[PDB]
């Protein structure tokens, strides 16, 4: 067991191993507080997250276990990984606090799309890396659920990592009105007309790629209905074959009130774009989620010819998510989490 030391930073006690020095506050959502630190064992600048109220309810205890399981699994160049996890507790009986350690990220994709002149080569490389990471995530039967520019870290060498997996955390208030939290979400889930499946992540990639080509949000709706009307104007209203698959009475009832509209000409929307970029956008931004391109198919599209290497696009080890259907008490979720903290092995 390492030696721990204590300090108070913005009204919070931080108890951490001596290896972590120069702690300075960076941020605090409702899920926890974050400090930047220098890790003297590895020489990395790191983010240290202290979870808030991790075992306050069954819902919260299960979310803690979910997050730790996911971060322990993810071992890929284009996905955030776990550098360390610790607790100051010396036994399960005194266990209350969980701290998560990752590489410190600087710029996100929001920063670079607002500010920098992107060539077609920059768009090819950034979207390639998102799809390489998504091939690996989807091979584990994990859905990200929250891909958007603020969840994509990018360094000065245009190298990209996916972070901030959806832990089923977003509220109705957070999705209301003129908000980036909704602009990247697939229609069939905006009002929960379809059960979630991995195809919703490819919709989000299409929205992100469009915004790197134009510098503008693709579907900046003022509310869920405004956003659906912007989507259907571009991709067309549902056809007969994609009404036959829509089981939700709520969906067919609103959908069938709208005047029918054809799919627009994407070369006239994305004026001047690489024709191969236009073609790939037409294959992602399809209303019928069964007919969307997959991450593995998209890596083999001609748009990525300069970067595609089918011997360097790895898949994940199998991921057991059977806990998601299991009914346990708070202390049972807490013991499972404790076990996962003590069994952690750091990366090479
Ligand atoms: C199976 C499938 O692709 C599916 C299932 C339910 C709803 C929708 N989409 C829509 O209802 C909307 F796009 F018009 F919003 C699509
Ligand atoms: Cl230490
Ligand atoms: Cl990482
Ligand atoms: Cl503790
Ligand atoms: Cl964003
Ligand atoms: Cl597993
Ligand atoms: Mg985020």
From Swiss-Prot:
Annotated catalysed reactions: L-seryl-[protein] + ATP = O-phospho-L-seryl-[protein] + ADP + H(+); L-threonyl-[protein] + ATP = O-phospho-L-threonyl-[protein] + ADP + H(+)
EC number in record: 2.7.11.24
UniProt GO molecular function: ATP binding; kinase activity; MAP kinase activity; mitogen-activated protein kinase p38 binding; NFAT protein binding; protein kinase activity; protein phosphatase binding; protein serine kinase activity
GO biological process terms on file: angiogenesis; apoptotic process; bone development; cartilage condensation; cell morphogenesis; cell surface receptor protein serine/threonine kinase signaling pathway; cellular response to ionizing radiation; cellular response to lipopolysaccharide
Annotated disulfide bonds: none
Activity control summary: Activated by cell stresses such as DNA damage, heat shock, osmotic shock, anisomycin and sodium arsenite, as well as pro-inflammatory stimuli such as bacterial lipopolysaccharide (LPS) and interleukin-1. Activation occurs through dual phosphorylation of Thr-176 and Tyr-178 by either of two dual specificity kinases, MAP2K3/MKK3 or MAP2K6/MKK6, and potentially also MAP2K4/MKK4, as well as by TAB1-mediated autophosphorylation.
UniProt keyword list: Acetylation, Apoptosis, ATP-binding, Cytoplasm, Kinase, Nucleotide-binding, Nucleus, Phosphoprotein, Serine/threonine-protein kinase, Stress response, Transcription, Transcription regulation, Transferase, Ubl conjugation
PTM sites of type N6-acetyllysine: 49, 148
Expressed in which tissues: Macrophages, monocytes, T- and B-lymphocytes. Isoform 2 is specifically expressed in kidney and liver.
Principal cellular location given in the protein's record: cytoplasm
Motif (TXY): 176-178
GO annotations of cellular component type: cytoplasm; cytosol; glutamatergic synapse; mitochondrion; nuclear speck; nucleoplasm; nucleus; spindle pole
Subcellular location: Cytoplasm; Nucleus
UniProt xrefs under PROSITE patterns: MAPK (PS01351), PROTEIN_KINASE_ATP (PS00107), PROTEIN_KINASE_DOM (PS50011)
Keyword Cytoplasm: yes
Modified residues (Phosphothreonine): 12, 176
Catalytic residues as annotated in Swiss-Prot or TrEMBL: 164 (proton acceptor)
Residues binding ATP: 26-34, 49
Pfam families recorded: Pkinase
Superkingdom of origin organism: Eukaryota
Protein family per UniProt: Belongs to the protein kinase superfamily. CMGC Ser/Thr protein kinase family. MAP kinase subfamily.
Subunit organization: Component of a signaling complex containing at least AKAP13, PKN1, MAPK14, ZAK and MAP2K3. Within this complex, AKAP13 interacts directly with PKN1, which in turn recruits MAPK14, MAP2K3 and ZAK. Binds to a kinase interaction motif within the protein tyrosine phosphatase, PTPRR. This interaction retains MAPK14 in the cytoplasm and prevents nuclear accumulation. Interacts with SPAG9 and GADD45A. Interacts with CDC25B, CDC25C, DUSP1, DUSP10, DUSP16, NP60, SUPT20H and TAB1. Interacts with casein kinase II subunits CSNK2A1 and CSNK2B. Interacts with PPM1D.
UniProt name for this protein: Mitogen-activated protein kinase 14
Organism name: Mus musculus (Mouse)
Organism phylogeny: Eukaryota, Metazoa, Chordata, Craniata, Vertebrata
């Amino acid at each position: 067991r390492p030696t721990f030391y204590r300090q108070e930073l913005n009204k919070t006690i931080w108890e951490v191993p001596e290896r972590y020095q120069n702690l300075s506050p960076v941020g605090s959502g409702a899920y926890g507080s974050v400090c930047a630190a220098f890790d003297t064992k590895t020489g990395h600048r790191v983010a240290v997250k202290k979870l808030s109220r991790p075992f306050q309810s069954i819902i919260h205890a299960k979310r803690t276990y979910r997050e730790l399981r996911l971060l322990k699994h993810m071992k890929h160049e284009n996905v955030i990984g776990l550098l360390d996890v610790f607790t100051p507790a010396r036994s399960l009986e005194e266990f209350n606090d969980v701290y998560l350690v990752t590489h410190l990220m600087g710029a996100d994709l929001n920063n670079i799309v607002k500010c920098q002149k992107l060539t077609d080569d920059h768009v090819q490389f950034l979207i390639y890396q998102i799809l390489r990471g998504l091939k690996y995530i989807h091979s584990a039967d994990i859905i990200h659920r929250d891909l958007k520019p603020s969840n994509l870290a990018v360094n000065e060498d245009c190298e990209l990592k996916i972070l901030d997996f959806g832990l089923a955390r977003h509220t109705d208030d957070e999705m209301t009105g003129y908000v980036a939290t909704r602009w990247y979400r697939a229609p069939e889930i905006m009002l929960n007309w379809m059960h979630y499946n991995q195809t919703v992540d490819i919709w989000s990639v299409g929205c992100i790629m469009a915004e790197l080509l134009t510098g503008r949000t693709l579907f900046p709706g003022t509310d869920h209905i405004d956003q659906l009307k912007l989507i259907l104007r571009l991709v067309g209203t549902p056809g007969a074959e994609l009404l036959k698959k829509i089981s939700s009475e709520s969906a067919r009832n609103y959908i069938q009130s709208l005047a029918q509209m054809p799919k627009m000409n994407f070369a006239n929307v994305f004026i001047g774009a690489n024709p191969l970029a236009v073609d790939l956008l037409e294959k992602m931004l399809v209303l019928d989620s069964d007919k969307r391109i997959t991450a593995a198919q998209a890596l083999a599209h001609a748009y990525f010819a300069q970067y595609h290497d089918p011997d360097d696009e790895p898949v994940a080890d199998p991921y057991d998510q059977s806990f998601e259907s299991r009914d346990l008490l708070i202390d049972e979720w807490k013991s499972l989490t404790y076990d996962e903290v003590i069994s952690f092995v750091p990366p090479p």
